[PDB]
Amino acid sequence: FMDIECFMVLNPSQQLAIAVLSLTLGTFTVLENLLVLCVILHSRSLRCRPSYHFIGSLAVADLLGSVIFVYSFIDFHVFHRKDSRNVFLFKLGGVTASFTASVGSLFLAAIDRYISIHRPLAYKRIVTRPKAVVAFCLMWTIAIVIAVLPLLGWNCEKLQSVCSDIFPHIDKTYLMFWIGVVSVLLLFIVYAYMYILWKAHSHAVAKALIVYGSTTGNTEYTAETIARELADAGYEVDSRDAASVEAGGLFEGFDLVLLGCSTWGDDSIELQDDFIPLFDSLEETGAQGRKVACFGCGDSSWEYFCGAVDAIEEKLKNLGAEIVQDGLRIDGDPRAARDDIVGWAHDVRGAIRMDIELAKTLVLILVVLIICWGPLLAIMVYDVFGKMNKLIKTVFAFCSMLCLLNSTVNPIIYALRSKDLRHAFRSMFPS
């Protein structure tokens, strides 16, 4: 038993600001989605290839949600309308389902693009047109079912219950359940997109592994000269002396692997004593379908010029490691052959990032969702655990406007970014 006017914290100036922000964004949001829906149906008449299952659901939810929200919000605040419990829970159920289905659409958009990254080869087997058709339908029914529950029962007046100080006639247990399901998909949305950016961050920069024997220090100076062209180009480098290497999984996670070794053949071809242990235990090395290249120092005076490079390349192509370019072979000092070093290093780089606008969009969406749903659900958690003062009700009233802004910026985030929709919008014009 709570007074309806107790939920109405309304300063005539605060009432005008509420009305201004809600009638601008409201009329602006409705016109946006009413245009988006018109474009899809116009596009449906011309092209049957774009699914438009996600953008249509998001637009319908934002249109229906905003229309009922702005009207009820202004009627409740500016006009101070006192409705019966069922008539209010009918209206509150309507907006809640629409906004729930809206964020449920973003949840289905998250799983659509999460499966494409986690399981690219199996994406076409899971996400289909009938499955997405059924999923959205069930997403809408569940969204309606949950939001109709307060009207059916499970409210603060039907049961001896502890009520909400921001939503009249609502049981806090129902809100905690509603917050839970909304928070789970939101956290999954945040987790998925954060999982996309961290996964794409490792692929942007390539990793190059350099090992060398070099008793005298020439193949090291070579590798040190080899590494800088790679490093200056933008390659993560992990040069390692062959005397301090671990055999098993030595090449794991390297897009390119450069194996340099000096030849030390007094009588017969012999490699660097430090490079021999790694040579023997190569099978242990990943040694498979790994882009790899060789280099090494030698001298013309010997019958086997850089025979080490030949022995290594024979084991690499034996196990199937793709040798992208021939091994680099140097005699004497590589300080005079610096040009050929950076030449072979730029060539092995030639023979072989991410969409930042799509990467920033995820950042933007995450920043948007954290901005629009963070404080909104936060105030509701304050209502569930303990209670709040009058200022928080006023802040929540302004924060109730914050989710409406999300419905305004969504057709700019997704529909405007749709290359197919913009084609359908231009097709509206003569030719």
Ligand X SMILES: Cc1cc2nc3c(=O)[nH]c(=O)nc-3n(C[C@H](O)[C@H](O)[C@H](O)COP(=O)(O)O)c2cc1C
Ligand Y SMILES: CC(C)(CCCCCCN=C=S)c1cc(O)c2c(c1)OC(C)(C)[C@@H]1CC[C@@H](CO)C[C@@H]21
Ligand Z SMILES: CC(C)CCC[C@@H](C)[C@H]1CC[C@H]2[C@@H]3CC=C4C[C@@H](O)CC[C@]4(C)[C@H]3CC[C@]12C
* CB-based contact 323:293 (threshold 8 Å): yes
Nearer to ligand Y, 76 or 212 (CB): 76
User: What DSSP string describes 299-323?
Assistant: -TTSSSTTHHHHHHHHHHHHHT--B
Q: Rounded distance, CA 143 to CA 61, Å?
A: 11
Is the Cβ of residue 45 or residue 300 nearer to ligand X in the bound state? 300
Q: Does 225 contact ligand X by CB under 6 A?
A: no
2 binds ligand Z (CB under 6 A): no
| 3 state SS of 263 | strand
Residue 144 binds which of ligand Y, ligand Z, ligand X, none (CB < 5-8 A, kind-dependent): ligand Z
What one-letter code names the amino acid at 220? Answer: E
Which residue is listed with tokens 């070093």?
Answer: 341
x/- mask, ligand X, residues 250-279, rule CB under 6 A, reads ------------xxxxx--x----------
Q: Of the two residues 174 and 251, which places its CB atom closer to ligand Y in the complex?
A: 174
DSSP one-letter code for 282:
G
Q: Are 104 and 143 in contact (CB under 8 A)?
A: yes
Task: Kindly give, in sequence order, each residue whose CB lies less than 8 Å from that of residue 20, ignoring residues fewer than 6 positions away.
Answer: none
* Near ligand Z in 41-80, by CB under 6 A: 53, 56-57, 60, 64
Stretch (H or E) spanning 236: strand 235-241
Is 91 among the residues that bind ligand Y (CB under 6 A)?
yes
Please choose, out of 78-86, 93-101, 120-128, 291-299, the segment that lies near ligand Y by the rule CB under 6 A.
Answer: 93-101
Q: Is 94 in the site for ligand Z (CB under 6 A)?
A: yes
Segment 372 to 401, residues that bind ligand Y, using CB under 6 A: 376, 400
How far, rounded to the nearest angstrom, does the alpha carbon of residue 323 sit from its chain's CA centroid?
34
Q: Rounded CA gap, 66 and 75, in Å?
A: 14
Name which of residues 339 to 398 contact ligand X (CB under 6 A). Answer: none
Return the residue of 11, 202, 216, 288 that touches ligand X, per CB under 6 A: 216
* SS3 (DSSP) at 87: helix
Number of residues that bind ligand Y (CB under 6 A): 18
In angstroms, the CA 193 to CA 86 distance is 39
The residues that touch ligand X, with contacts defined as CB under 6 A, are 214-219, 262-266, 269, 297-299, 302, 304-307
The residues that touch ligand Y, with contacts defined as CB under 6 A, are 7, 69, 72-73, 76, 91-92, 95-96, 99, 166-167, 170, 175, 178, 376, 400, 403
The residues that touch ligand Z, with contacts defined as CB under 6 A, are 53, 56-57, 60, 64, 94, 97-98, 136-137, 140, 144
